[PDB]
Design a protein around this ligand. Sequence first.
Ligand code: HEM
Ligand code: HEM
Ligand SMILES: C[C@H](O)[C@H](O)[C@H]1CNc2nc(N)[nH]c(=O)c2N1
Ligand SMILES: C[C@H](O)[C@H](O)[C@H]1CNc2nc(N)[nH]c(=O)c2N1
Ligand SMILES: [Cl-]
Ligand SMILES: [Cl-]
Ligand SMILES: [Gd]
Ligand SMILES: [Gd]
Ligand SMILES: [Gd]
Ligand SMILES: [Zn+2]
Lengths: 401, 401
Amino acid sequence: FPRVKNWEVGSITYDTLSAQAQQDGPCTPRRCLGSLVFPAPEQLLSQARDFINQYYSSIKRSGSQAHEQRLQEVEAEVAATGTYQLRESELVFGAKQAWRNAPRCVGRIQWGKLQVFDARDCRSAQEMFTYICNHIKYATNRGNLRSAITVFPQRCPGRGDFRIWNSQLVRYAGYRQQDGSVRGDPANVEITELCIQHGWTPGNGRFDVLPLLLQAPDEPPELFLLPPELVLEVPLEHPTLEWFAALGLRWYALPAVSNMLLEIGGLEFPAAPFSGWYMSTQIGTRNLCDPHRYNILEDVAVCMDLDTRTTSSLWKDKAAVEINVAVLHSYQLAKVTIVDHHAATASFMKHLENEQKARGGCPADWAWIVPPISGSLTPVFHQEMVNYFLSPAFRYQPDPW
Amino acid sequence: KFPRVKNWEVGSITYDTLSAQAQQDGPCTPRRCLGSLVFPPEQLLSQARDFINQYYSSIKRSGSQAHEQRLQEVEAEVAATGTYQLRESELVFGAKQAWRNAPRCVGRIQWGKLQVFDARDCRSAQEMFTYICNHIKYATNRGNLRSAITVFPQRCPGRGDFRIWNSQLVRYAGYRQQDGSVRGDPANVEITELCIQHGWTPGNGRFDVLPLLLQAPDEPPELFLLPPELVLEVPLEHPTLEWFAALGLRWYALPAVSNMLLEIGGLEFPAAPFSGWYMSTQIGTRNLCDPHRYNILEDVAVCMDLDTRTTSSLWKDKAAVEINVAVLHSYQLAKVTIVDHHAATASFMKHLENEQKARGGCPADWAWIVPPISGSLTPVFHQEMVNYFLSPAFRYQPDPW
Ligand code: HEM
Ligand code: HEM
Ligand SMILES: C[C@H](O)[C@H](O)[C@H]1CNc2nc(N)[nH]c(=O)c2N1
Ligand SMILES: C[C@H](O)[C@H](O)[C@H]1CNc2nc(N)[nH]c(=O)c2N1
Ligand SMILES: [Cl-]
Ligand SMILES: [Cl-]
Ligand SMILES: [Gd]
Ligand SMILES: [Gd]
Ligand SMILES: [Gd]
Ligand SMILES: [Zn+2]
């Protein structure tokens, strides 16, 4: 049982939950690969049985008649059909637990407050589109964002998967350029190229919202345009740098990850988009300042009249701080939910304490929890963490193309 | 079986083939990653043959006259006496390798330039003091810092060891009060308590340089007042915030780690103080702003008239950047070598590239290479890394009590 120290306070805890880690990660006693971004009815029965056990523990009915009856129903369904169906309440519990178990999520204090939309009866790409529009609308809630997930039908033998080809429901186009550069978000070049290939007439601005490419089973993807009035956006200004508005920068309200696989009790849902609300460093530091994204840092630091010829002036650090101030202020001004990296990491420390009492530990990926500016200024930096895989889970999956 | 390692800024891929040599098994398993934790008789001949082979490979002299001969005498030495003495050049070559293998050192671009002071003929805390005093004055060099390591006698069975009871050669005192809390450095409250207990006059200051506690084999320690003209210190001022100097802050010139255990070819040196020069975040962000260190962050924000009532003003981030600006400006004005975190991480990326060609990879600890401020603004944030233990190495060791 790993002992875990907080260095700011001196406290010490042991992670007993890690002992229950189901799947395996990329590290060995030889070598740690923690910093890497990307690390049969009987085994289906085994995962199912474990999840049903989890479910009946949560409702204080472990070992009950209804518990044994459900184990039997699942075994019989897996024997007759090679798969099984989740009850509605098992689905809700399973989606919340997947969030709870996500080691790279700093927002998990909120895990119990999740709106689960059961789209497991979805029939086509066209119905998928309507469900997704309802998700964006409910989650955005006119700027008072609400956490939600929409669960589309599970993977099942004899039929292809539902897939959302887009990595998030709202993303900006990235157009490869005349002179080899990228106009717009360079992270989205490939999906942008796929949209045009599938009939989209491109724009040529830097913040053009992409269409949705939605795949129903055994069907090519289908293009759907998001209704403009469903996509709430925030123009970026700075509270005291008035030329900052003239950069023409914007970002969208809703972060809705749409390319990850939800696993519950051995069942796999390849289409199950989820959304919370932004932490300011995602927009301010990563999306805008990463050299391979919008890469605005030097341009802002010149406008700030910082001395960009020497690194020891800390011009990068000064420009980045003001970009993050601009993001926070603009979202507050527009009345769109946002959390700064200090508030978020402080709430995550409370989550770690809740989870130590409840489950004896908490899976956490230190390199993802610690914000990408002002790391040691936040309490998570001084907190040792144990990273491991629990199920239910959100997993990465390969791109459909 | 050779980890694929990606840089996400550029898209470039390499394979760490050097990882195949990792000896001292780390703390990670396929079940859980512990990469964020701070602290995780003729076996001597095996690590001797291994290290000697390392020596002769490095000079294009494997499988040649001189190579065999040195294999024999270490075998004879350990047969006749149970251990062996290192050749002068091997001690030099081993010191540089243990540096080059330190996964947590961002400074390793400098690893080939190292001055090795051979103190193996030492005996007693009076001799130690002069050797340490030679090191300090040499390494400081009037502020033109030079990397240096002083190797005190190797450990042998049946007789006590050489140890420096201080974690560094220059540390500041930490004094409790009528209420537990500390004037001075809270990281050194313990050794301050030991020094005062061992016959030292406590100061009344937040920046009193502690005395050395030097221990010869099987004998108690002895206190040694460090020659004040040998302890180069830098008063901290800001280039434009005129009141910053009035805060009365200072830091010392020389970072001289004196509690680690140099291990070469199976031999163990529990007293082998090494020293390089500071990266400015070490002082300005960790030493001054950590909540459990000098904890000055809010005092500086009051002085800057920042709104400390809301976390979303990023008042912590702004105060922190200016504290780091003051450190860099102050050391440069005093003409004491120092490197900012942008220049240091840039040079590390160059080191990674060099080590890729030279040895097929480099052991790096992502959580320690990435600076404690502005992490994703430096190139190392976007570089995946493999951590593993190679020998020769610096290792941690328990306090001598
Ligand atoms: C309520 C507010 C929420 C906040 C503030 C938040 C915060 C974050 C942040 C900052 C990241 C790192 C993302 C990145 O750097 O790309 C992250 C990752 C993640 N979050 Fe949360 N999150 C929230 C809600 C949710 C919800 C509702 C779910 C699912 C039900 C979820 C599941 C995940 C997962 C699976 C990841 C890993 C995704 C990846 O590796 O790219 N989060 N979260
Ligand atoms: C010359 C310029 C150097 C720079 C700029 C530099 C920078 C750093 C930094 C910032 C750390 C992190 C330590 C911490 O956060 O407490 C570190 C760790 C370390 N360095 Fe270097 N260093 C230098 C020279 C050296 C030398 C000369 C040696 C040994 C010969 C060395 C070996 C190590 C070791 C063993 C650690 C790990 C210390 C620990 O875990 O407590 N470095 N270095
Ligand atoms: C190489 C490194 O793993 C990579 O840059 C990671 C580091 N930490 C991160 N942390 C978060 N929250 N999001 C990220 O995309 C990353 N990227
Ligand atoms: C908990 C965590 O491992 C701890 O705070 C580490 C993180 N990374 C670090 N990195 C460096 N260079 N120095 C440190 O002291 C630490 N502290
Ligand atoms: Cl995003
Ligand atoms: Cl230090
Ligand atoms: Gd202004
Ligand atoms: Gd411009
Ligand atoms: Gd004033
Ligand atoms: Zn690991």
